[PDB]
């Protein structure tokens, strides 16, 4: 996010972070409930990867974060690599998230749901802040 | 990348005004946002785009792609949850 500000600690309870066995954050995901995560297909998540929830400051060791394991990765099959169209994979968690004041679910809309141009929304994450 | 979580508000555009930018790369299962002075960037991917719908924050898109330079002028391109909730809806039943 180039040009964002720091979030309030635990104010986006559905945000998870995908890190490799190295502990390198490379993608973000979203909790749809305490067993499944939603992130992008292009992320290329494997099951040797771990989901992390309850995190805020990726660099603090005194934070009660939850390191969840990947059971199976579900790549939408309509996903188009050449286009990056239908870029949605689902993550099936081997070990159930424990919801709390900082770990919760995001709401999915109806295929029917409408969200019109010029509507203000919000996007969070730990992407580069400068290019 | 930054150590703690960032956030940024940003306006959703129509796909059309988007085609303006990405032209024929924008597909029906993609929805744009940004070009407001904020920009999604490397490491953002897979992450959330929420909008407030009747009290709750709803998964309106997935940080997917856009500018190589993370230009606060090009709008970013997100997954369009609305055209994919049906598959989600379905993978869960299944498993």
């Amino acid at each position: 996010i180039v040009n964002g500000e720091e979030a309030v600690p635990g104010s986006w309870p559905w945000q998870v972070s995908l890190q490799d066995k190295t502990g390198f954050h490379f993608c973000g995901g979203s909790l749809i409930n305490e067993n499944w995560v939603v992130t992008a297909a292009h992320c290329g998540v494997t099951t040797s990867d771990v989901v992390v929830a309850g995190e805020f400051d990726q660099g603090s060791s005194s934070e009660k974060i939850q390191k969840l394991k990947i059971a199976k990765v579900f790549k939408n099959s309509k996903y188009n690599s050449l286009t990056i169209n239908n870029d949605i994979t689902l993550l099936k968690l081997s070990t159930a998230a424990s919801f709390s004041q900082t770990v919760s679910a995001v709401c999915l809309p109806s295929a029917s749901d409408d969200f019109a141009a010029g509507t203000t929304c919000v996007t969070t994450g730990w992407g580069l802040t400068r290019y | 990348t930054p150590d703690r979580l960032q956030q940024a508000s940003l306006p959703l555009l129509s796909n059309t005004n988007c085609k303006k930018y990405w032209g024929t790369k924008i597909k029906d299962a993609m929805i744009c946002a940004g070009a407001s002075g904020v920009s999604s960037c490397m490491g953002d991917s897979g992450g959330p785009l929420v909008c407030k719908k009747n009290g709750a924050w709803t998964l309106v898109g997935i940080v997917s792609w856009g500018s190589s330079t993370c230009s606060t002028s090009t709008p970013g391109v997100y997954a369009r949850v609305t055209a994919l909730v049906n598959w989600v809806q379905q993978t869960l039943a299944a498993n």
Binding site: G10, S11, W12, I32, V122 | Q7, S9
Partner: peptide, 10 residues
């Protein structure tokens, strides 16, 4: 869902 315990600040 979608309604946090810690309300986000804008």
């Amino acid at each position: 869902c979608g309604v946090p315990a810690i309300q986000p600040v804008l």
